[PDB]
Structure formats: C-alpha cells, structure tokens
Paper text:
We reconstituted Gβγ into liposomes consisting of 2DOPE:1POPC:1POPS at a protein to lipid ratio of 1:15 (wt:wt) and incubated the liposomes with purified [name]β3 prior to grid preparation. One Gβγ is bound to the PH domain and the first EF hand, referred to as Gβγ 1, and the other is bound to the remaining EF hands, referred to as Gβγ 2. Both interfaces are extensive, with the Gβγ 1 interface burying ~800 Å2 and involving 34 residues, (16 from [name]β3 and 18 from Gβγ ) and the Gβγ 2 interface burying ~1,100 Å2 and involving 44 residues (21 from [name]β3 and 23 from Gβγ ). The Gβγ 1 interface is mostly composed of hydrophobic interactions, with three hydrogen bonds, whereas the Gβγ 2 interface is mostly composed of electrostatic interactions, including 10 hydrogen bonds spanning the length of the interface. The distal CTD is not resolved in our reconstructions, suggesting that it might adopt many different orientations on the plane of the membrane relative to the catalytic core, in agreement with previous studies showing that heterogeneity in the distal CTD increases upon Gβγ binding. Only small rearrangements occur at the Gβγ binding sites. Unmasked refinement of our final subset of particles from the liposome structure yielded a 3.8 Å reconstruction showing the [name]β3 · Gβγ assembly and density from the membrane.
pmcPhospholipase C-β ([name]β) enzymes cleave phosphatidylinositol 4,5-bisphosphate ( [name] ) into inositoltriphosphate ( IP3 ) and diacylglycerol ( DAG ). Their activity is controlled by G protein–coupled receptors (GPCRs) through direct interaction with G proteins.
Residue numbers in the entry:
A (entry chain D): 8 to 51
B (entry chain G): 8 to 62
C (entry chain A): 13 to 92, 97 to 470, 576 to 849, 867 to 881
D (entry chain B): 4 to 126, 133 to 340
E (entry chain C): 2 to 126, 133 to 340
Amino acid sequence: SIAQARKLVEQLKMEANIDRIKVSKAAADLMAYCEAHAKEDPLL
Amino acid sequence: SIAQARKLVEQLKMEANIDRIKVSKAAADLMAYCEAHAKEDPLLTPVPASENPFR
Amino acid sequence: LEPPTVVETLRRGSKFIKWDEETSSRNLVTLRVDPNGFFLYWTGPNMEVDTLDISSIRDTRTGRYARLPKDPKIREVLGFARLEEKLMTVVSGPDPVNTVFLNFMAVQDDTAKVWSEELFKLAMNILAQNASRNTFLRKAYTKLKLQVNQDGRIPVKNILKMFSADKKRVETALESCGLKFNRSESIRPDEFSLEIFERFLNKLCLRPDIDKILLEIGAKGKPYLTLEQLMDFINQKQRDPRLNEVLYPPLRPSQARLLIEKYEPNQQFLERDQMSMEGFSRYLGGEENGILPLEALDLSTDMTQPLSAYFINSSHNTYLTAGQLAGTSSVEMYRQALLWGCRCVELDVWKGRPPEEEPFITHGFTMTTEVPLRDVLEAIAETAFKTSPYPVILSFENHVDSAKQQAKMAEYCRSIFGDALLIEPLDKYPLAPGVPLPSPQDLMGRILVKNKKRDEGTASSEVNATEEMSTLVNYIEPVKFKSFEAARKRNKCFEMSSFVETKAMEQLTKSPMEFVEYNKQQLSRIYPKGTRVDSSNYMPQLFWNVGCQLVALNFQTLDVAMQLNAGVFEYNGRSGYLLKPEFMRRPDKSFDPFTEVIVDGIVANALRVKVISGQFLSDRKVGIYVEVDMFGLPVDTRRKYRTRTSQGNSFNPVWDEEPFDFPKVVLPTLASLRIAAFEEGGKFVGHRILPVSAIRSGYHYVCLRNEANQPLCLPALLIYTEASDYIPSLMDQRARQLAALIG
Amino acid sequence: LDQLRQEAEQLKNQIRDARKACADATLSQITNNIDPVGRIQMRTRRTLRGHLAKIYAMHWGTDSRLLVSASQDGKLIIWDSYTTNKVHAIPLRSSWVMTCAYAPSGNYVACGGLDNICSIYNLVRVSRELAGHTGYLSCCRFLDDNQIVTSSGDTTCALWDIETGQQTTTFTGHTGDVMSLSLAPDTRLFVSGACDASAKLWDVREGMCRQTFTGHESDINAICFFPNGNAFATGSDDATCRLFDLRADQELMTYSHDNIICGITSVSFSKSGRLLLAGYDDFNCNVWDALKADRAGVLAGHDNRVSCLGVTDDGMAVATGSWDSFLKIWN
Amino acid sequence: SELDQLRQEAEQLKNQIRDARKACADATLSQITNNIDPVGRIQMRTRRTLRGHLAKIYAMHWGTDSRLLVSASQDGKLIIWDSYTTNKVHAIPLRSSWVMTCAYAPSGNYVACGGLDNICSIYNLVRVSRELAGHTGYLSCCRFLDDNQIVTSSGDTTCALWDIETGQQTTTFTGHTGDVMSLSLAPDTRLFVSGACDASAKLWDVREGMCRQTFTGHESDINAICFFPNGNAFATGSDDATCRLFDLRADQELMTYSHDNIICGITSVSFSKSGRLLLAGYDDFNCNVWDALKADRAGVLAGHDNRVSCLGVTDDGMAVATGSWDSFLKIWN
Ligand SMILES: [Ca+2]
C-alpha cells in the first residue's frame, strides 16, 4: 500500500524543479492574444 | 413405483450390449442406394409426357 | 398473497374443442398459458394465435354450472352420461352487463376441473391486479409476441396498432433498432426480445418527467447514482410520514444494495454499488415503488367487531340490467354481482301463475321481463363465496299473497343454500334487548334472510309474512321506522329500518348526530328513489358520512357513484367488508359529522397531489386533462380540481403547473382520492380511486383501470403525492354544504 | 430407489461415449464429392374437390392409383388420381377423425380418430371394430390383410389382429403422447415419434422397444421410413427435419434454415430416397435433399395449413392435403 | 514510523507549491484588464435546426473545414450533418446503444464513438472499421491526433492513447482518483489536459506518458474542458456552476466566472475564435456566453427546453452548435 504513496513522492518532487513563470508577462500575453486577432472573430 | 424404475434399467440393460458399424460405412450404405436408383426415380429427372400418367 | 404461478399442466397444454352456439362452429385447439401468467392463447382456426387477457376473466364455471349446448348439430358432435365434467366456459368482459363466453370442451377426462380451478386462481390474484408498472409492460410485450401470423412471425401491422398515437415515430423507431420497418413485412419472434422491446420503448417517447426527478436527487454529470444518493432518496422523498418508524424501519445501506442488483443492467455499475440512469427509470415502476402498500390490499382488518360497524357492499334491484321501467331482468346479473364483491342483494318475489304456483322475480307494475325464483337461488348459492368468504344478506321484497307460494319459497332456501342458511341464532349472541350483532368472523360462510318477522317504488306495498317465511329471519330484520328516541330507548340491536334517498336526506340534515348515535348499534340500508328510472345513482358518500352500512346502488349503470363503490371496496382483500373509522363505531365519544373544524380525537391529514405526466394515454392524437376529486366528509369533498388540457404532442403529455392541495381533512380514514384522466371531449380513458390513510408519498406510477376496476395494460400516470399530519334556518345551514357532494 | 437412479443413468452416459466413439465423419462430409440435384419444380397436375371441412390424413395405395382422405366432416372419401372420380363415399359415425390408412391388398381402408376406436372398412360397411385404447387415436398403418399397428394417446402403440380384434402386443415405453408412426418396406420393424422428442425403433416379432433415439426439443409430429430400411427421417415442432440410422444411433443431418420457424406436419421420401418432402405449417411444402441439406423447390400451392403428405410406391407424384378441403397432387 | 514519515514530506513540498504561487502572486486579470472596454450586448438567433435524432443527444464534434459536424445520440445513431444545407449525409447505426462521446478526424475521413460499453469503434467513410477494447470503466470522451493515434478518457480513472492499426493500449496514463469525465487537446497536440471527477485538472504529456502539472480549485465535479487557442491556457466546467481559466505557464487559476442566480452547473465549455468569448452550457437550458477578460455575462442563448449537453464553435469561429436532450441540435450565429 506504501508503493501507491511512493509513486506520489516521485510525482510531487518533479513539481519542485519547474521554472516559475509569473503572471505579469503571462496574463498580459493572454491580453495580447485577444488583441492581435481582434478582427478575425465572427461571433462578435 | 420401483418396478417402473426397475424395468427402466432392464430396458436400458439390453441397450448396453448392442453392436454398431462406423458412420463412414453408414453414410456409404445410403450413398450407394441413391446413385444406384437415380436412373429411374421420376422426381430427380422428369419422365416423357407419354409415359407420364398425370399430364 | 402469492405472485401468479402457472402450474405445469397449463404451460405445456391440453386439447380442447372450442365451440360457439352462435355460428355452430367448433375447431380443435390446444390451450396454453404463457409462463408469466398473462394470456390464454391457442392456435386459431386459420393458423392465427388468438388471446384473452387473463385479468379480464370474471369467472370460469365448469361442471354442472357450465353452459350446455342447445343445438342438436353441436350436441351430436361433442357427444351429448357423465361427460358434463369436461366442459368449461370462461366468461369475460369489462362490465357486468357485457359478458362474452368461450365455450371450451376438454378431450381428456378430469382436465377441466384442473383448468377451471386454476384459471380462476389466476384471474382473481391481487398481485397481478395491483402489479408494478414494469409488469404492465411485459403484459404488453407478451401480447405482441404471442399473436404471430400464419408464417409464425410478428406482423408490423400489430406494432403500428398498439402504439398508434403517431405512426411516423413507430416506423422510425423500428427502423433505428434493427428490425423490419415496412407496413407489410414481419419480425421474427426470436429477434424481437425483451432487451430489444425495452430498447424500442426508449426510442419511442421522450421522457422529461423522469429527467425532472434526476435533477432534484443530485445526479448531475455522471451517469450513475451512488448507493448513498438512492438510500436517502427513499427515506427523504418517498417515505409515508404518518407511520411509526420503529415498526416500519427505514432503509439500510445493506438493504439498498439489493435494489441495485435487481434492476441495474450494466456490470461495471453492479460491483461498485452504483445505479445508472436506466437503472433508475426501471426502479420508479418497480415492485417496491407502488402507489399503495400491500397491507391495505389483503385481508387485514379487525374482523372481530359486530355487524353494525361495517361498510357492507350492497345493491338495489340488482336483477335489472337496464332502466327501471322497460328493461330486461336476468339471472346472470346476480353471478356478476356476488363475484364483484357485493354482499347484500335484492329480490322482488312476485306471485306466480294459477296454472302452477311457483314464485318469480320482476319489477312491480312495469311489465319488465320475468326470471323464475328457483334459478335465482341456484345462481346465488353457487357463487356467493367464490371471491370472498364473508356473509351475504338476502333482502326480499315479499309481494306475494298466496300462502302456498310462501311455504314453497321457504323450502327452496332451506334446500338450495344447504347448511349455509342461518336458521338458528348463535350460541354466543342470542336475540334479547341489549346485545350486539354477530361478527363477520362468526358468520363467515353463512347466508342471512331479511324479511318481516312475526316514492318508495314498490317497497311500501309489502305484505304481512306468514309463520314459515318468518322462521328464517334471525339477526337482520326490518321494522317500520318510528322515531329515534323510540329506537335508542328500546335498544334491540337486531332491528333495521330501510330509508329511501329522499326520506334519509330529510333525516341526514334535520338531526345528524342522533343518526350516527343510532348507527353504532343497529343497521339501516339506503336505496335510491323511484324517480331515477334511468337507473342512475346518488352518491353513496352522502350516507357513509353518518355511518349507514348497506348503502345500495344500481350495479348496471357505472357512473361516478358506482365507480366509487367498486374502487373503495377493492381494499380489505376484495371482501366487500370495510371497517368503519373509530369514532363512528364507539359508544362513548361521538361527534358531529358536519364539523368545519377538526375534532379532538381524530388526527387530521393534509394532501398535495401533483399530476406530472402520463404515458400511452390514448389511441388517437388528442389532448388529455386530469380531474382529481376527493370524497369524504362534506368539509373534505372537493370536486372542482382539474388540470389544463395538453397539446396531444406524443404518447406522453406533460402537465407543468401547480399541485392540488387538500389542507384540512377532518376524518382521513373515511376520505378517498380519485384521479380520472379524460380525453379532450369527455371520452373516458381511466381512473383510479385510492384511500387517503394508506397512500404513500413521493414519485409513483398510478396505473389506470377502466370504468369497472379492471387493469388497463398500457396507460398510466406519474403523479407525486405528499401526505402529512395536520399542524394547526337549520336546513340551509346544512344543504349548502352537501351541494359539493350531491352534484 | 436411490441405487436405481445412478446405475440407469451411468449406462445413459455409456451411450454417449459409445456414440462419440462412432461419430468419425458426419454425413455432410462424405457427400461433398457429389454434385447437388440443383433445382426441381413440381406443378399442380390434378386437384381433388369434394371435401367439406379440414382434411387430416391420406395414404396412397400400393397399386399407386387411388388414395383416401378423412375430413373433419367424418366423410371418408376414396379418390382416383387418374380420372378424379370418387370411387366410394364412406360416412363415419364419429366426425372427429385424426388419421387414415390403406392396405397393400387395397381391400381394407382404416380410419380412426378422437373416438379411440380404429374402425376398419371393407371395399360399403365396417368389418372389424378395433377398440381398447384409453386415449385418442393418432395414426394407424396396415401391415397386411389382417394386422394393423395403431398409436394412441395413452403413451402406447399396438399390434392388432383384426380377425379376432384383440391386441396381441402392447408396444409400451413412451412417457407422453404418441403422435405418428411408420412401418418398414420389409414390414419387420417400425418407428414411433412422441411428444417427448423421442423417436424409437420397435420390432413386431418379440414386442420389445429395441432402440431409442432422442435429440429434438419439441414435439415430434411425423416420421417416414427410408426405402432402404436403414434410415428414418423425423419432423419436429422446432421447424427441423433430421435423419437417423438404426446403426449409427444418432442424427446424421439436420435440415433447418433461418426464416423457417413454424412447425412441421408430415414428411416422406421419394422412390429412390434422394429427396425428402416435408410439409410445413406456413402453408408451403419444401423439398430438401436427403444428402445435401439444401432446398430444391417449394410447393407453394395451398391456402391453409398443410397437414398430410404421401408419396407413391411407383414414385410418380406426391399429394398434399391441407386444411381448406383440398388435395393437390404434384408431379 | 514509516507510513507517517512520508506524509511529513508528502505535504511538505505541496506547501512549497502554493508558496511558489504567493511569490508569483503579482496580478489578476481584474487589475490588469480593467482599462479594456467590453463587447456590449451579444444576441444570436437560431439559424438552422437539425431535426433528425430520436432521443437525447449526448455529444457532437465539428469537422476540420468548418462544414460537417457529427452528433452521437443516446439511441445509438451517429449522424454526420452538413451545416450549410441541413443535410444528414450518413446515418451510421451502432452496436453500442448507450453513447456518451463522438469525434472526427483532422484529415476528415474517420469518425469515432464510445460510451457505456467500454469500446471505441472507429468507422470509415459505412462499416465497422476498427474496435478499441480494454477499458474497465465507461468511455466518456475521445479525441483524434491524426489518422493513426487516438486518445480516450474512461471511467476506470485512466486515460489511454491507442494505435489504430493494432488496437491496443499503447500508452496508458494513471494518477486520478475519481472518474475522468472530459479531455481536450492543445492546438499543437504536444500536451493534453483532462478534468477528473474529484476536482482536479491534470496535464498529460503525450510523448512520455507521465504528468507534469496538476491543478486544483473546484469543490465538486468537473464535466467539461477546453483550451485557449494559443495553447498556453485552458478552461473547465464544474458542478458548482463556475467555470475557470487556468494558466499553464503560471500554474495558478486566474479568473472565476461566478454569478448569482446561477445554481445549475456547466455541462459543456468551448472558447471562441479570437478568445474573447467563453461559451458554456447549463441546466437552465440556456447557453450563457461569457466574456473572458472581464468575468461577466454578455448574452443568453436560450432556445432549448431540456438541458444542454454539448457545445462548440467551428475551426474558424463562424457558427456555434448546441445539442440538447430534446434531439434538437441548433446552430447559432
Ligand atoms: Ca324493488
């Protein structure tokens, strides 16, 4: 039963070594996506 | 009661010591019969209308 | 109570010569009964399998009771010494007046006593009359599988006839499930299986009435309930909350695991304790989710109380089959009455002829057709105890004047009835002033005689009895009604006094409390006036609400009054005896019946019937509207409720509107619901009359009957009841109340 | 009674492994090296009007000219298939007939029915009145001038002697109704089909049930005997014909098909034994092959249920009796 | 002493996960898109009503050329519709009656199926061309990569990528606990996410068969998912009646589309062409189109009577088809 939990330890240890992308550039890129295609949208 | 079950075994008793022949010969006895009689059977091949009594 | 079981000598078959006196044509067919216990099918005269709905069988009389052939062409063919033990006639039909005969004749010895005993056991079985909804769809699938054509396949002209609201769906719904969908083609009976017919009915109709339930119980996105979401669906929404929960235990998570393993089709849901959407559309018309429980349908009432404290099903001039003036009297009408559940019949014995002196039956001074008396008592003693072993009260209108006809009709009853005619008083209850009447238990299997001891129509010109006819009158006895204070002071509880409908409305409203105070000791029958010459009926609820016992109707014309007196006597095991509620049979605590307020001593209920929808309601594309009556005490009677008519869109309409409330019913063990569904245009479809203290709450299928309480196969409703306890110029004072009840 | 159950059934599994030891090659394997008969079509040559109700049974003569029929009117009629002249007209005294027969001499024609009594007519009036069945009679066939084998509904058969009228031997051993029987062309043995799905093979010499055959799952309605004497073909209510042998002790073919559901009523063989003419319940008579298990033509000619057949000893034609009072002779 | 000493570290780094979000907690879209004007009042109309089904529609999928749409129903009848001329081009029956999904191909000559019978049956454009068995739960949603490989999502808490020439579970994915109700692909098909039943949104990398990112946030079921068209964000449905918008770069939920008088939960989510709109379905039979960067209702698409079961714009964003439970698959514009 511990081997189910020992999969989770190797599941969460790879969540530590992920590059942090902050929301300043990221959410503004989602802002920039809706503006770069703002006239190619037949439901507005 | 018991006697109908007694004779049920005794009728089945003579069914044990019966003899047989193989189905390869049993399907050869039938297959000899049809082809030796297919020349005159009036239902495989029809007959002339003169000898035919129903026409 | 047993489920309908087919014995081995009915599944395999026997060989029966079916004859008919009309066309004088007899074949040689082999009768069978399909293993569910539904139909009586035989391969026909031109190789087309006929049927007969086995719930539409009223009696199967054999032997000396059967119908003998009268034509010497048929008589010389069948062979007419002791061979009138192989006959069998199976009467059928919806009403008592309309009966068809199926004159069989067996070809082996002693196979007709076995059959006709085991067909009457299958026609009068409770759990195949109050059955499930899913049982009433296997009764409409077996009808489709039996009636094959000559080739032996199911014709598509039968599937386009049974579900025939719009045939543009059935031609589409057959073509999408993988069968032959043309107008003249055939489906083979082993590629038309119950798994396929179930898949046929899902494609046929669209069901938002079920899907509205599946949003309130929490099934949101996953196609399965849990065990927990079902275990508190029953104990929260579909549990009758009048009842004591210590004796009626709520549902356990080990008990609800069987409800999954009985209905759920998929295997990946069965092992995980989860029920799919098709498992819940199967459960709602299962054998546990019924509109009534099986404690109020079998013979479970306190049968120890005396005979003054019971509703006794009764009749008035029950020998007639038409209007009261120019009709035709019969003798078959007694057999259809005493089999239905009647327990008091009427006989108008009139003086016979001067050629030979023997009495007979006819209506006085109307030149109606006459039936002889000797063949009436043989049609009474035969069938008095074939459905209910509880006593029958004969009620003579003795009109003869000769002395020799009086003794001759006295010798008939002591000969035809045998030992079942109560000629002596019992040991425990002798006829002295101050005693009570016997119970139905201690009179079980006996037959009493009502006659004089030693706008009325014809019952006012009655003759003084003689010393021979007066020997049979023992317990129930007529005496001319003088007053109330003379009756209570005398205190002989073996007297009765008949009242017409008029003179008992002059004594229902003038003094109702003394009427109930008298109706706990003694009897009083009620029979309608002579000005209803078309044989219509007054409401019996006018005179049960003061506790009369033998309220008598006309059994021939089935209007809403006679559709009541055979829907309120279907309970207590169809025995024709119902116990009066507690404060109408107790000598200490009396009450006014006309009370606009609740009474201290009776708990009051409240009801909210919501009529959601209903499937397969009609043969033609037309709208349906539902009336929800509720009879009772005059402060309970509401007859104004009705839905709006639907559009006739498909097989099932949907009504989406407010529920019908009944807030304060003072006496709820006397009240009774009624849910009639009409066609748009007054044409009847069905009705079901339920009692009030026994009806469950929650989402149920009410499976409609016809106008004489025989089950219909396809139509039903999906209603939602909600019962709970209640948490709070004298004539015109009372005549303005009964006008909701008289109509 | 405990010991009797197992030692009887232990021999009943001694049959199956002895049957499995014999079943080396079923008959469909050997006949593949022979071409089929292809298509064969018969037409209605004569038609026999004069009956008034449903027709139940028929049996050609050994002189191969006449026949007989037994209607529900109780009107036994002897036809002539050459000129369509009713040669006699014999009225019964019990209109519930169920079978008839014909003698090899041509002089005696028997007919019995639901009235349990096998009357025998002379060629006119009854000569012998054979009674003793406590159930309904279902089929009877003549052996010779003096002996007739009947098949009642009291789960028996019989072997009479009509000069005395007494039963010589009661061929008992069935557990349900006995539906039909068929003698042998050498007239030494016969078969019997029941409502227990139990064909058999008896013998007229000793009186014993010699062999026993099972295999169907419904009633058995009619059985014919092969013109070799080696085989016999049965017909059941499960819309199948089968073909056994007295030596192989097992079914050898199974003449079934899809879109054939309703039961069977009467079978027979041809003169050689090549065909197997069955008469079904969906009003058509089929022609199978005794070796190929393929159809070869349908006799779609009747308007009600076809209830009896019979093929002449000269093999000229067949005849089908139906429920609409018609006898169609097909050649 | 061993089963406790892992739980001290099984929740140690998880607390570093949320504390990494606090270091990344810089702004939301309410404080960075507040100077953006809305789109106004959005009205649509029933352009074409595709009658032709017999029972509840349970899924649909658009084609590649924005013309053909498939629609599997509960009666077991795939119909490949033509939106331009209101045509039933094919009508493929099924051997699996209880359906809950359907698909189409990017090249456009293959269809899929699925449902309660645990089998995904690829057809050809009509005969049964393939079969995919091996799931021990109900099939719920299946999508296509190309003509050779197909992903599914099942009721046995496992997603599975298949091969269409062999018919076996080539790559199998594990890690959820409840059922797996829907999945969707990124527009590059390099990484696909799926939403479970027990309130999680996990991302599976297709090239390796092992997760790399796990989202949380819901308190109930998840019944739909769909991608933002640039492939760096996605959005889900729920049972708690709130859609979301997650950031695959920033690992954090960004915006909730919550509103009062909204008690029915979502059953279908799909974005629009330029990513300004988020459409949705509900149990009030409407189809509330939400503006993305303002978290606000902007239009009601109310043309049904029973609940909405599937929804989706085209590959150019011209039309939008909602398939309800009344067999009436509309097209809005
Ligand atoms: Ca009268």
